[PDB]
Amino acid sequence: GPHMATGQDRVVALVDMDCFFVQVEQRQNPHLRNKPCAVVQYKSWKGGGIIAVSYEARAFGVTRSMWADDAKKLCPDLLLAQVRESRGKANLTKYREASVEVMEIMSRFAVIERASIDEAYVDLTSAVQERLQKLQGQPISADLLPSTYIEGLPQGPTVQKEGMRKQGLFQWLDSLQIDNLTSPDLQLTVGAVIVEEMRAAIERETGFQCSAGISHNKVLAKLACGLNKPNRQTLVSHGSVPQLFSQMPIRKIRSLGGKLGASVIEILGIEYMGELTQFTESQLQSHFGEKNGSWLYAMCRGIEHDPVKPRQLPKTIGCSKNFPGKTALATREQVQWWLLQLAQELEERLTKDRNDNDRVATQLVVSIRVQGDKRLSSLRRCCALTRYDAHKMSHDAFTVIKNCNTSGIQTEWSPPLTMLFLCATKFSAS
DNA sequence: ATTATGACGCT
DNA sequence: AGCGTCAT
Ligand SMILES: Nc1ncnc2c1ncn2[C@H]1C[C@H](O)[C@@H](COP(=O)(O)OP(=O)(O)OP(=O)(O)O)O1
Numbered sequence A: 001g002p003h004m005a006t007g008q009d010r011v012v013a014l015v016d017m018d019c020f021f022v023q024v025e026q027r028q029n030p031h032l033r034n035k036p037c038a039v040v041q042y043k044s045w046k047g048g049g050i051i052a053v054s055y056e057a058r059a060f061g062v063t064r065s066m067w068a069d070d071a072k073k074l075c076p077d078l079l080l081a082q083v084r085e086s087r088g089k090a091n092l093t094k095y096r097e098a099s100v101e102v103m104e105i106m107s108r109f110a111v112i113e114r115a116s117i118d119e120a121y122v123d124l125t126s127a128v129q130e131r132l133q134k135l136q137g138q139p140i141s142a143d144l145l146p147s148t149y150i151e152g153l154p155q156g157p158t159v160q161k162e163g164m165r166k167q168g169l170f171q172w173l174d175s176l177q178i179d180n181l182t183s184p185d186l187q188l189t190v191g192a193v194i195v196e197e198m199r200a201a202i203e204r205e206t207g208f209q210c211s212a213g214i215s216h217n218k219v220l221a222k223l224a225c226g227l228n229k230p231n232r233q234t235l236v237s238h239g240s241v242p243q244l245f246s247q248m249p250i251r252k253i254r255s256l257g258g259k260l261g262a263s264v265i266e267i268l269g270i271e272y273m274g275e276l277t278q279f280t281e282s283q284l285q286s287h288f289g290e291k292n293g294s295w296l297y298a299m300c301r302g303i304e305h306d307p308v309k310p311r312q313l314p315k316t317i318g319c320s321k322n323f324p325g326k327t328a329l330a331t332r333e334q335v336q337w338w339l340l341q342l343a344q345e346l347e348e349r350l351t352k353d354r355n356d357n358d359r360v361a362t363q364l365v366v367s368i369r370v371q372g373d374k375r376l377s378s379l380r381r382c383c384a385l386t387r388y389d390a391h392k393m394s395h396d397a398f399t400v401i402k403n404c405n406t407s408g409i410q411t412e413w414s415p416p417l418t419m420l421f422l423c424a425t426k427f428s429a430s
Numbered sequence B: 001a002t003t004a005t006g007a008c009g010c011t
Numbered sequence C: 001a002g003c004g005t006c007a008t
C-alpha cells in the first residue's frame, strides 16, 4: 500500500534520431530528401549492405541488413548513399560528427547519457521541477505538446491519426491535477513539454528530426520512443503500464531481445511482459539469477532504477573490419597491411579525441576471428597503448596475435583471418 | 558474405 | 583479464 514504491521518482526521456544516417545524407544532398532512400556500405558484393532506410523506402519493405540489389527488387527507384571509404574500409566519421551536433544540443537542456550513435537518455527530473515553479500552477495547453502521444489514450467516449492524437492528449490534459507539484503524471507532462522544446531545437539547429519517449525510467522511455515514430514523441505514464504490458511481447523490452528473453518465455511458459507479475521475486531470481530476477520483478510493474549516467562521450574508440569468404587474410603481409590500415584510422581518431576531449587512451585491445569460428571474436588480447602512433600500434597488435598462426611456414597465415579489430580503451585525463 | 561499431556482465 | 551478451 503506502510503503509500496511505484518507481515514479524520476522523469527520464530517450531521444532517438529518425533513420539517422539517411537524414545525415539527405541534409548533405537535397536530391535525396523526401525519397525512398537507404545508406549502404561497400558495393561490389550484391550492391552493398544496407544499414539505414528512409521511411518512404520502408513502405516498400526495404530493411537494414538487406543487400542493395535485393532492396532494388522491392523498390526499383530506391536512392542510395554510400558510406565513405578510407584506407580500404568503411569510415563512419561523418555520422559520428553529426552525432556530436545532436548530443551537444541535448546537453544544453540536461545531463545526458550517450546510448548509441543516434540516441541519448535525459534525466529531466530537476528541469521539470524548475519549469513547474515558472508555471505557477498554470495549466498546460495542448499547444505546448504539438507532437506528443499519450499512450493508452483516447479510451472510451476519430478517423484520422492526428485527430486520434489530439483526442488522447485532450483526455490526458483534462484529467491533469496541476495543483500538485509532486504529481508524477504532471511531472511527466512537463517533461514532455521540455522534450518538445529539445526536439524543436535539434531540428532547428541541425536539420535532423527525431522521436522521443518520456516516462519514469530508461526502459519505459526507450519503449515509449518507438511507439510513434517518426518525428513524434510518446508519454508512457505509470498508469498506462498494465494495459501496455498485457500484450507486449517480452522481447520488445530492452535487454530481453536475446537468450535471456527467450529463456523467460520458455521456462515460465508466458509471452507478454505483464504475465511476469504472477511470479514472486524469489521465483524469478531462482530461474534468472539474483540481479535479473529482481530487475524483472520490478520491470514488469513499470519500475526500474538504472540511472541516467553522466556520459556524453564514448568510452572506447575502435576500428574493425571483416574479411568474409575468400577475402580472408592468408598471408602475413596481408595481416600486417590491414593492421596498419586500422591503426592509421585509429590514430587519426585518437589524436582528434585527445585535442577535443582532454583525455588519452592507455590500453590497446586487439581482437581477431579465424575462419570457421562463428563467434564474433575468436581471440582478444590487450597491450599497452603508450603513443598515438599507427606503425607502433600495428606492430604491437601483430606481436600479441602472431602466435595465432598455426601455419608452420613463415609467410603464410592459417587459418585465415576473417576479422581484425583494434580498440583504444582505459582513458585518463590529459 | 547481416558490417562496424560500443556498453556492460561473468568468472 | 578474456569471454559472452545485447544493443544500434
Ligand atoms: N546493425 C547495424 N549495423 C551498422 N549500423 C547500424 C546498425 N544498426 C544501426 N546502425 C546505424 C545506422 C542507423 O541509422 C543508426 C541508428 O540506428 P537505429 O536507431 O536503430 O535506426 P535508424 O535511426 O536508422 O531508424 P529509426 O528511425 O527506426 O530509429 O545506427
Ligand SMILES: [Ca+2]
Pocket (backbone or CB within 6 Å): A016, A017, A018, A019, A020, A118
Ligand atoms: Ca534512430
Ligand SMILES: [Mn+2]
Pocket (backbone or CB within 6 Å): A016, A017, A116, A118, A119, C008
Ligand atoms: Mn537508435
